[PDB]
Design an enzyme around this catalytic site. Sequence first.
Site, PDB file in Angstrom:
ATOM      1  N   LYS A  20      21.407 -39.654 -11.868  1.00 33.38           N
ATOM      2  CA  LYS A  20      22.279 -38.568 -12.386  1.00 33.38           C
ATOM      3  C   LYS A  20      22.929 -39.040 -13.694  1.00 33.38           C
ATOM      4  CE  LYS A  20      25.798 -35.298 -10.735  1.00 33.38           C
ATOM      5  NZ  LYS A  20      26.939 -35.084  -9.821  1.00 33.38           N
ATOM      6  N   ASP A  67      31.829 -27.088  -3.161  1.00 29.88           N
ATOM      7  CA  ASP A  67      30.620 -26.449  -3.754  1.00 29.88           C
ATOM      8  C   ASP A  67      29.465 -26.545  -2.759  1.00 29.88           C
ATOM      9  OD1 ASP A  67      29.211 -25.152  -5.989  1.00 29.88           O
ATOM     10  OD2 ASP A  67      28.333 -27.123  -6.453  1.00 29.88           O
ATOM     11  N   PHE A  94      21.452 -42.972  -7.407  1.00 28.39           N
ATOM     12  CA  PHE A  94      21.403 -42.507  -6.002  1.00 28.39           C
ATOM     13  C   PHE A  94      20.078 -42.941  -5.380  1.00 28.39           C
ATOM     14  CE2 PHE A  94      24.562 -39.635  -7.947  1.00 28.39           C
ATOM     15  CZ  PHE A  94      25.606 -39.755  -7.053  1.00 28.39           C
ATOM     16  N   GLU A  95      20.117 -43.123  -4.071  1.00 31.46           N
ATOM     17  CA  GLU A  95      18.911 -43.092  -3.210  1.00 31.46           C
ATOM     18  C   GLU A  95      18.122 -41.812  -3.514  1.00 31.46           C
ATOM     19  OE1 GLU A  95      19.792 -42.399   1.018  1.00 31.46           O
ATOM     20  OE2 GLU A  95      21.800 -41.759   0.399  1.00 31.46           O
ATOM     21  N   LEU A 111      16.030 -38.629  -2.509  1.00 31.15           N
ATOM     22  CA  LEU A 111      15.975 -37.720  -1.325  1.00 31.15           C
ATOM     23  C   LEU A 111      14.779 -36.804  -1.537  1.00 31.15           C
ATOM     24  CD1 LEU A 111      19.756 -36.877  -0.686  1.00 31.15           C
ATOM     25  CD2 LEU A 111      18.338 -38.743   0.188  1.00 31.15           C
ATOM     26  N   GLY A 142      15.419 -32.756 -12.722  1.00 31.44           N
ATOM     27  CA  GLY A 142      16.235 -31.534 -12.823  1.00 31.44           C
ATOM     28  C   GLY A 142      17.373 -31.648 -13.820  1.00 31.44           C
ATOM     29  N   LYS A 143      17.994 -30.506 -14.099  1.00 27.63           N
ATOM     30  CA  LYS A 143      19.166 -30.375 -14.992  1.00 27.63           C
ATOM     31  C   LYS A 143      20.243 -29.635 -14.198  1.00 27.63           C
ATOM     32  CE  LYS A 143      16.564 -30.122 -19.459  1.00 27.63           C
ATOM     33  NZ  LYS A 143      16.973 -31.447 -19.979  1.00 27.63           N
TER      34      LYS A 143
HETATM   35  C1  LIG Z   1      12.253 -35.849  -5.253  1.00 23.96           C
HETATM   36  C2  LIG Z   1      13.129 -34.772  -5.820  1.00 23.96           C
HETATM   37  C3  LIG Z   1      14.529 -35.260  -6.121  1.00 23.96           C
HETATM   38  C4  LIG Z   1      15.366 -35.413  -4.896  1.00 23.96           C
HETATM   39  C5  LIG Z   1      16.767 -35.844  -5.155  1.00 23.96           C
HETATM   40  N1  LIG Z   1      17.284 -36.987  -4.758  1.00 23.96           N
HETATM   41  C6  LIG Z   1      18.610 -36.946  -5.161  1.00 23.96           C
HETATM   42  C7  LIG Z   1      19.644 -37.851  -4.997  1.00 23.96           C
HETATM   43  C8  LIG Z   1      20.861 -37.513  -5.518  1.00 23.96           C
HETATM   44  C9  LIG Z   1      21.036 -36.297  -6.216  1.00 23.96           C
HETATM   45  C10 LIG Z   1      22.357 -35.856  -6.726  1.00 23.96           C
HETATM   46  C11 LIG Z   1      23.532 -36.447  -6.269  1.00 23.96           C
HETATM   47  C12 LIG Z   1      24.770 -35.949  -6.704  1.00 23.96           C
HETATM   48  N2  LIG Z   1      25.906 -36.504  -6.300  1.00 23.96           N
HETATM   49  N3  LIG Z   1      24.867 -34.925  -7.569  1.00 23.96           N
HETATM   50  C13 LIG Z   1      23.740 -34.337  -7.999  1.00 23.96           C
HETATM   51  N4  LIG Z   1      23.878 -33.305  -8.802  1.00 23.96           N
HETATM   52  C14 LIG Z   1      22.462 -34.757  -7.573  1.00 23.96           C
HETATM   53  N5  LIG Z   1      20.037 -35.409  -6.341  1.00 23.96           N
HETATM   54  C15 LIG Z   1      18.871 -35.759  -5.818  1.00 23.96           C
HETATM   55  N6  LIG Z   1      17.695 -35.057  -5.827  1.00 23.96           N
HETATM   56  C16 LIG Z   1      17.503 -33.714  -6.363  1.00 23.96           C
HETATM   57  C17 LIG Z   1      17.034 -33.723  -7.795  1.00 23.96           C
HETATM   58  C18 LIG Z   1      18.014 -33.095  -8.704  1.00 23.96           C
HETATM   59  C19 LIG Z   1      17.505 -31.814  -9.235  1.00 23.96           C
END
Ligand SMILES: CCCCc1nc2ccc(-c3cc(N)nc(N)c3)nc2n1CCCC
Length: 335
Positions: A46, A145, A96-97, A99, A24-25
């Site tokens: 990130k 947020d 990050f871990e 998710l 993602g962006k």
């Molecule tokens: C399998 C699909 C991806 C799952 C996933 N694990 C994540 C772990 C951390 C973060 C994240 C943490 C913080 N502090 N800030 C942002 N902006 C994103 N985001 C995650 N995501 C979402 C993907 C980002 C679009």
Amino acid sequence: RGSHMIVKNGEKWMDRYEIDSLIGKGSFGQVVKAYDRVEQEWVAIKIIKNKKAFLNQAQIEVRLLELMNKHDTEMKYYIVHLKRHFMFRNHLCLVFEMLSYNLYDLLRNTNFRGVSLNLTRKFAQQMCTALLFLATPELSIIHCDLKPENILLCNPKRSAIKIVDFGSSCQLGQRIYQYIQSRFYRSPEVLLGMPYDLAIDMWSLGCILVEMHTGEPLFSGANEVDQMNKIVEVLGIPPAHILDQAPKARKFFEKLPDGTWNLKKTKEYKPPGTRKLHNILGVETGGPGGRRAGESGHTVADYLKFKDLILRMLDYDPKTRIQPYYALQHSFFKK
Ligand SMILES: CCCCc1nc2ccc(-c3cc(N)nc(N)c3)nc2n1CCCC
Ligand SMILES: [Cl-]
């Protein structure tokens, strides 16, 4: 050339991370999926834009995430785990871990008809515990947020959630950013230009929980004036003691000769307080759009407890708005 790091699927960084894809962006930069060879697991990286403002937000996010990770409560596990941070190709990188789906993706998968009150209650209970964690006096973190997009499932077939993205966050008493909160989830006190504390995150949670069960935003404003008008449709004119102290009261309201406030005309809304949450949730009429009629775990009694907790989270007065400790004691959560 530009703010973004160039990322080709297949690359390997520092002979530790194998890059798989761009998940993602966002405003902040990029998130890539990668495999950490020393920890032997998938990570979400990130990648912050190489621009002072994004670097600066991310540097607060690193400090707040490392502060939270120092705490020895089980409650800290409702916040995403920052494994590591490092500089690479001139970008701050937060590991990050990994998710799973965000709560907006969940709603999309139901075709925006909502998840069950039973799953809503499990998300509400975890989010109240996460907010109780953030209100730890030594933390005193305002997320600033909260929205369905910033709440993620740990695993795609389990109810366990975590909060992400402390890019806009601050600690109690700070005023850093001109505008804060995503517009649909923005508290009356932020709209009114009044001082804000941890109660603004409880406001966001109230809005989020209604959307998760109905499938649609409670207050879908297209601008601040529309936002405040959509709030007033449900909750009525804010108390005079608030509006009398609000720097931006006259952006939305007019004080009458009597000393009573009502809405400014804009230059097409239901009368104040007549779009009842009781009818939005369908307490007596089978839940949202009548779709939960009969279904177990959707009784009138269940709905009244849900409605009553939401209205305590949507109190106009941030001094009396329900706090995380008391939210957790609500009859909505009784087994
Ligand atoms: C399998 C699909 C991806 C799952 C996933 N694990 C994540 C772990 C951390 C973060 C994240 C943490 C913080 N502090 N800030 C942002 N902006 C994103 N985001 C995650 N995501 C979402 C993907 C980002 C679009
Ligand atoms: Cl506006």
